[model samples]
Target: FYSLLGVSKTASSREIRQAFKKNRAYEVLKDEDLRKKYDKYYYRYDFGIYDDDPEIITLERREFDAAVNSGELWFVNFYSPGSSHSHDLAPTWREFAKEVDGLLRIGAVNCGDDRMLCPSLFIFRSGMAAVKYNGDRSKESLVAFAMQHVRSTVTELSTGNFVNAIETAFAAGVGWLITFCSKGEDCLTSQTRLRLSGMLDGLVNVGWVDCDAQDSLCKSLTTAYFPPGATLNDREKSSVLFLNSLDAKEIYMEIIHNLPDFELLSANQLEDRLAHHRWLVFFHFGNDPELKKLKTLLKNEHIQVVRFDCSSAPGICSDLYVFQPSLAVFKGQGTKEYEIHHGKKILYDILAFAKESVNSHVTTLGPQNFPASDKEPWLVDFFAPWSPPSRALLPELRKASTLLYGQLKVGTLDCTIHEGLCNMYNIQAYPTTVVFNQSSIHEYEGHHSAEQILEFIEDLRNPSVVSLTPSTFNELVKQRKHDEVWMVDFYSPWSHPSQVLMPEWKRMARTLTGLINVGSVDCGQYHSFCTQENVQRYPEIRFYPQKSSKAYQYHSYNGWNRDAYSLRSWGLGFLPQASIDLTPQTFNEKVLQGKTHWVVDFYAPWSGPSQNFAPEFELLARMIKGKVRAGKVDCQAYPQTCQKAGIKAYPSVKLYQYERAKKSIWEEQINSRDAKTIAALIYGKLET
Candidate 1:
């Protein structure tokens, strides 16, 4: 309507100020050009005063509550289309939302259309508090006011506490979005991180560490911003997303978006795009509320979600027989339909479809590709095709298979087709889950959800009793390098007596975590391997002792009572030479010359202090076995290497701490006689 006049919004405002010769004179008519530019700006605005864009979400007042509740933080503009003041401030809002970007969710509501008042702004929280913006409407002011609404949720991290905290956070399964700010609180990134923590509260963890002192620690995190921040999912040389710019929204988007760019491919464009990348195409007739939320569910997935329109034009949806609203999974460039999902478009169901299509980790175990001889541990699912629970377990298994990718081989066998394999493993029911490892089959029972399945695998992974296959049995027991002993269960998978003995063996292993390596051999899977070791029966329990220069060694368990307590008692008799018997000659070569950090005990065996300390030293050595060495010297028998080595008292515990060059620092005296006290002191010094 304003364009219908000779004067445009910009021109009319000028005319209104000067003339209305009538603006109480000429001055007001010219001034009114500024006001009428405001008029025509609103009049010419094609979409409402505020339209929906990727950056700015257009909301109606009716659905505002639900929209506000959807996001943790939202900055909403309540603008009136008819209001001139609203028109003047419209441009500022556009730049504000664009600049602030994904840092905060920006939404706009039309007060004029909803029969409400003119321009107003508020920051809404989900079930929390609502804040109204009352001051300047400039772009900088608006963004500043909106971002200021964010509260800090960062964990204060430092050099001393970093590793333990990182392990805790990783074990809790949350990735860190860390700030390695050189100036700590005084840096420019400080305020931005405060806002970032609020925006990504539970989605990811926020870490703040001062890079001022530990430049090496922070520099190792990699380069760029002085106050470098990064998103780390795994520790040590993995995917760490760092910032290119300090723009809060850019940094927010960098961490949050796990997938590559989502596409809106047309019919012709879709055909070409599908040839290279695996795509889950959501073919819809029109604008969908579901399509926008689809990416949130799949951010962790490597596949892409493409929305293909079917409103009118010819689309590939029909060629793929995807007429209705459903997902078409095109895998490995085959457009002829690998799988079409009629399942519900929710997190679990659709996620399963997308994930299963992309999962190269879980193999289909058939007769041709049986996994018995593979060296890696295998967790196979024996399922009948028609079982309901088997179908329900599909997604969870897919997720777990992805999580356990390089560590274990996860496979599924159809019992209907491979009945021989199922029968061989004694799988009686549908969807029987078992881990075939260390040569024996151990069945799993419990919830089939991903979380529970992961727990089941974890417990079985580093079990109380180690599962033994041919490879591990030979490598660990038969051809072992170190002088550690092993108590192994050479048992058949299906024997009744061995079934009862399994739990007892596991409990024994738990009891003797370090003193002796407890393992099992699945004689059924490795018949030849087990027979070579002369395993004659169903439950042949054997103890293989240290491999120093002994030609050969092993002892068969002939005891009747095979409970964990009894087995542990039998294994205790074979505790290895945990206390390394050091000679006066080798002491200089092993401990003094090249010891990284060795704790050597000096004592005369006949003395009371030496006898008391000997047993405790064995326990302590067994406890901190890895990455450390322990030795015992008989001062009375072998005598003085220590007379020259400075032993003031009997049973003196000395830790040889490492320096760059070896020939220095003979011993850091540990004034403790007990194992626990010495263990604590040695380990405490070892760290940092």
Candidate 2:
């Protein structure tokens, strides 16, 4: 047990107990079953401090594998200290891990020092499922789940129990997972710490195996950590390419001997086909009557119809591709840039590529393709007049054009006849397709099959053109609510700082979910809002809500870096959305709900300090906008209200609350602008 707490056996039980008692040891032991067990085993631990070369805890792989093969449930844990809950929570998790020995394999991890294994295991694991907590504090909370087990000096075999715990947990299927930590300092109580130490000991008893190159799939699913690898194959490699090849002599024999109606695919039969193209085929092996019926139909279309005697073409796996007997068609390949099928958008690259490929375009001046000044959509087929696919697709294109536009007037240019025209347009492949929409035109690669081509049309919204324009301030102005929170960047379009920030502001605008109204108000565009709000600085960024009150606002009175990112950071710092208060209530209910809060600011609008600090106070109000009622009584505008709230300084801040029975107001001076100080005043952070 000394090993469990990183202590020595010679140490007194008082010290050992004290160490365990550090984090909620008593609270956890308070349970009758738990306390009885702790009392019985408290002194039995040898308390030896074991040290060795830094290595990962490993369990016997063979034992775990055998147990898994036997068919049992498994429990696994990836443990770390950075998680605030680990110390107190480990023991509960450990107990749970041990109780289900055969049915479950409970594992624990020490993520702090174990480097290689942790990163590798993180990928397949969900424990780190890397969903950064985005509330109140907004800071990433690495610790996710409560610890549920205990460690002990074990009675079992296997070299290292810690390793066994890992394997056992993996087998149990309770892999990477996370839980929340109990808040406030002394993060975990003494009793809980002792429970965790005990759980760690139990893990060490099961011989643990450290897999150095633990695969990534295991890592992501278990730890929520992504491996730093370029290629995690979406699919494992397959060895079986073809079940029945036309090249095979026996398959040909089956086609000829088994069915007279089916044509034996000879070298002559394949001569006219595209060299590198692979046919997606549906085949049927049936009686002579059926084969004879379909044979003549196949020869006319130049389709290589063959009989499947289980030998005709490689037999397709039902798992890989479903087969139908009577009816068969060569279904298209699944490879496409993007496809929406069955109501799911499938196989799209990350966001960046999608925007670029389908959106960006450039066009050149051509007779068939109108010059840049032309103001209409034009379809240009960059193909030869004789190419098999191109010739067959022309009529369909013409028909589609008529359906889209009157009379189907399309510019058809044969690249085979006009090689120079094709070369000028950068057409490298045969049977290319290009469309010119006013000034912009896009070229399609010819290698794609007809289905893939059609999918591209669907995805790219082919034959559709949209004029690009930035959404205007008018639309955003309409969206402003009665008292909506706004990250207002008081900007001048031509100002150097504003120019530098236009990109960042635009990026922020796109990213922000519009939960908070994000926009740059040109202090220059309409100086009225700025002047009315008393905008003093050149690029004054102010956070404005529907109204101002003491608790719901924050502002920066001191000097601040007047840049977009900096302002964004400041806005985020006091963002009302980031406020931890998740509950909702009316303005009156907030104050009357028995929560005492302080919001104090006193100054004349004409005063320099008041003007400088106006933005800060406004921010503070917005921060607590929904959580607490905010009211600003301008000293000049409401002298009586300011006097009643006890205003004494030019920019003095205070909190005011009315006595329920006395109907008298109590005011407290504003001491600091730190979030904790402000939060304390608003929510009464101080304990009586």
Candidate 3:
């Protein structure tokens, strides 16, 4: 409304008066034509009140709770309508308020008109309704002094009065405190913080403390208000501390900006924004007798609660929302306008106007400023929703999401307030896990075993994981069922390449588990099995569906790092050089039967590095082995012979294809398999 007024919302009463004085004349000094034209646009102005605009009203208590609990800084503009000096400070408040616009929420209250609320901003743990003040009994000087003190004396909460003060603020849904600072020691000062430390011992124990120099902090907010042409003394100057939500506001804002905006409206206006944007609304208190009437009133209409945790951020989506008192409903923003019913969480209803909740005909009366990041669809597990396994699994579930998704968003839904929602969702099992995606619920019924839950989620993400892994790898598979991507890691812990790949591998693992099912097979743990299948080396990687089951043996490991390839040639891709099938078939009589001992190389087409020496090594082996009863074998065709000979490296070397009777076939060098070096061993030359 202040934005609409062309004045700061925190403008002082004097400023308000000045604004009124300047505009009231132009607005009402009746010239026949002028009166008619001004009345057309300023009718609400004349009344000194404007019905909260539907476009800027969201008064949800939870949204306020989010802000307050966030611990982000907030600014307050405290002014007294009757104060003779308040008018002088109005413009200054507005300017400072704008300076901290994105960093804090600025609020204003008429000091004399709503004296009860004034105490909320002043005294600790006290309701405004109990405050006592007379416009005249207190001198204007006292009022001004009190306002200044309130601005200056925000105590950093720890436990006692300080913590109690913040708790009181949260209960009242206020993230900002604007009140009086006492004249001497009571003003905000390093000394005052020390005093507050004693007042709220636990608050300090809990790590909440004022961090700025007393005067420097105060000057930031009070600079504009210093008396014109006079440099106010540090003692005379009052400070304004923006005490607020503990969480960093910018971080939350960034998160919200990245999330899909949930479209919410008053029950009456559900029809308006339903065409686009996921939407929801929460009823503040189930015990509110009026809510029953409202529900009954809307029962016959299109209005209904969105009872699921869901998201719709393009490729990412969720419908889950936390509205403590009752169910939260969500809708999309596809229409031009909407009309919504309004109700009371009393003050929340009023603040809604400030938050743009009163849009079009939608009287949105809840926290509309909730960051989307905080709005992630999650299930907050509590006793009411607990079973032994599910309860135990709760921590694991959160950890899994964090470890896998980099985030854990859990929201509590109380049966006491949302009995209808629970019933509607058919939540018979105490520990039901409902999936939130694209603003819809896919409830996995009954208590799930850990493996079952993991598998179910995996299936959701990618259905093929069930059949993708070898039957022996059943334990390594998980499917969330709703997703479409499958990731399987075949690793050996003992393998160096596996160790090198761990960091990124774990990150990807978490993502798959969090959003889908990803599988893993540890060859190191199943070493003998790997050897039986011709895997003699560690850390082998294979991709399937693309490589396929039939082609599993025919692939390469994509490592080129020094640490990764230290086991073999450093510049070549992959370690253990993907076993190739290169073995001699027979000794020959027609060739030079026993001329210098012969070495033959064997390999298969499927091996990654087979191309490196397949032709040249084969030509060299055939040339020497051919002259001395030497030849090669394709292990792909003779796995039994290759395994018995310990021929894990494809296209590996073996001597004496002609001297088989002497068992000289074991003399080939795996370390000397590189052609540049193999020549030395075959010719009986000196080592390099």
Candidate 4:
């Protein structure tokens, strides 16, 4: 009994009980009379009494093939008793096999005694074991790797079977096929059946339904007018419905014969197609006698069509404005309601409509009919009459012109006829496309494709930064009326630093798109405006706050590098903060006579270094709001206070100590204009 359970003879009752549960040892050893009867046979080399349990099977060399080929999941472990590793792994393997129970079959083969079986089991060494299990042997992994390889067999259906079979297949969320054949019908040859099964083995599930045994299931899968005795070789046989073809809930009558790019479109698929494309056509027809002719016509014309039955999808007909056996063409993006109605619908009429809708609407232009400067942007292609590239670019240009009818005006100008006009715009090439917006004309240096041209036109509509000139700058400033914050870069193209900072400045403009207005003043083009703004530097970064009469310079002293991150950080410091502004009238009442401690900055508006330190001082004011008060005194506006406080330079910070002194004694703060250092210095002084 101990040998049968693969346990030591000196094993305790607990060990024997575990082996009994693992190897089903109790089936024979439980009854004393039965065990005695089995021992008589087992002592004489008869072990057939232990073959009942499906969880674990003990296999000899003779019975190994039969056990593995039993059309069930098998996890067979081949090991040798001479190996200590094999012996050590046995307990864990047995416990795991018992835990899985009937889900899979586990078996053991001894390679030491059964030498011939070692070659059959494909084991090279005696110490190691390889099961048919492809999963990892480590106990730490969480994935059920063994079950991932196992798939439930295609169900064999009977009466009251179609619903459950279809529902289960649908719930599995995989493609499935149901074969509709009568009993003993030679619909498929033996070789063909095997080949088809091999083709669809793991890809799709298949169920067989005998039409004669279950007539209701046959008719349910087919139309109500399905022929009673349809032959396989006929043009249309008893139908086979495929589920989850185009979509999850979609059903299509799959034909046995091969047709290129043909499918029965479900309503869900039609809706999904319409959601993506601007144009689609649906042929709503049942199994009418003229379907074969209609399909041939559509196929010959190379127009794709999807067929739908009213009964299968009841509301889909009304939902898609499909009422009868008619052709409907839906157009446009949003509404999808611009449908063309048909009368006596034929293939030619449907073909004509599709061709007309897909073709482009273009305007042929000359000097007399050219688009005006103030109109919407126009993409004009100037081409020679006999040039090959010009001829090749025609179809793509026409298509783009049709698609972009409302957004842009697209036209072609013949350089051969109007040589004077082409030469005026410096058009020396055979094919040159130019985009015109207002008075600015930009020549296209890109490839001659519809998608490329479309991208170029769309980019013209929403520019990243608005270019400012002398006339445009005045208009912009007048329109803004000092109500919006504007960050403008006054740059000269000749300066090396200005040229280097152009890309970075443009990128900063795109990054801070909606928060603040970013623009540029070309000092090279508008020298008068730059001179008026006192532009001494090549690339000057300036910020104009809302309702501020004069713009303040960026604080470049505190490590303000010309990069995107530094520019964005400096821009954030310009946001509204808690700072008090002091004039000559309120300087004594708000600062010197106040009970709270104060940190004050006395600065001249025209000083370059003072302009550079404005943002950092504002940031310091916001940071130390409650612990100490921060205020700024404009020395340019109040000369008396500046002379009284002994201010000589543009910016000098002073902390006034109060509440402990009879008179406010001012302490000078000598530090770099950085928010962190200034805050730390103030915090240190306040602690003292």
Best candidate (score: lDDT): 1
TM-score each candidate.
0.34, 0.25, 0.21, 0.27
lDDT of each: 0.66, 0.38, 0.37, 0.57
What local lDDT does model 2 show for residue 134? 26
Descending-TM-score candidate ranking = 1, 4, 2, 3
Ranking, lDDT, top scorer first:
1, 4, 2, 3
Candidate 3 per-residue lDDT over residues 1-688, each given as its tens digit: 3333455533433334445543454333212233223322533232212112211121112133322222222333345654545555444445544433332334444545445544212211111222223333233333333333232233443324433443454344222222223244233344333322222221112123232433343332300111111122445334323232223232223222332222344433543545654333443422322222222112233343332222212111212223333333332443222222222332222222212221211211112321223435443332242222333333334333433342323333434335665575576544456655444455564333435555655544553323233454433432222223234456676676666765555444443333223445566566565565565454554422222234332344454542322312221222122223333333333222443455545566688565556544543443344343344556788777667667887867665433545533334454554543555455653121
What is the model-wide C-alpha lDDT for candidate 4?
0.57
List the RMSD of every prediction in angstroms: 27.9, 26.9, 28.4, 26.2
Highest TM-score: give the candidate number.
1
Write candidate 2's Cα lDDT for 324-354 as tens digits.
3422222122111111111111111111112
The regions of model 2 sitting more than 4 angstroms off are 1-498, 503-516, 519-598, 618-649, 656-681, 684-688
Question: What is the overall TM-score of model 4 with all chains considered together?
Answer: 0.27
